[PDB]
């Protein structure tokens, strides 16, 4: 009357193929907060009485 069976093998997950990476050289720039700086010369005369 009562009859059972063994379970058969299963499909195991495939190992994912994986990511591909591009080799490159990179230079990262940011916002400039430094003021523009340039040298100048002042000419004036102090006066007093």
């Amino acid at each position: 009357a009562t009859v059972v069976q063994f379970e058969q093998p299963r499909r195991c997950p495939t190992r994912p193929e994986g990511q591909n990476y591009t080799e490159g050289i990179a230079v990262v720039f940011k916002e400039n907060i430094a003021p523009y700086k340039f040298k100048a010369t002042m000419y004036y005369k102090d006066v007093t009485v």
Binding site: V4, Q5, F6, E7, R10, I33
Partner: protein
Amino acid sequence: TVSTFIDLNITMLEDHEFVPLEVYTRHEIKDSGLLDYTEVQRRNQLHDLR
């Protein structure tokens, strides 16, 4: 059906993105001072031309 197998459940750790976060920006820090000396100077040196 009965099974001779022992289960095991593995789920990959999902991706997670980190957004940029700042408590205070440097503009708020520059504004923290009660008197920005530069702006006071620029305003006050316009009196003759104004």
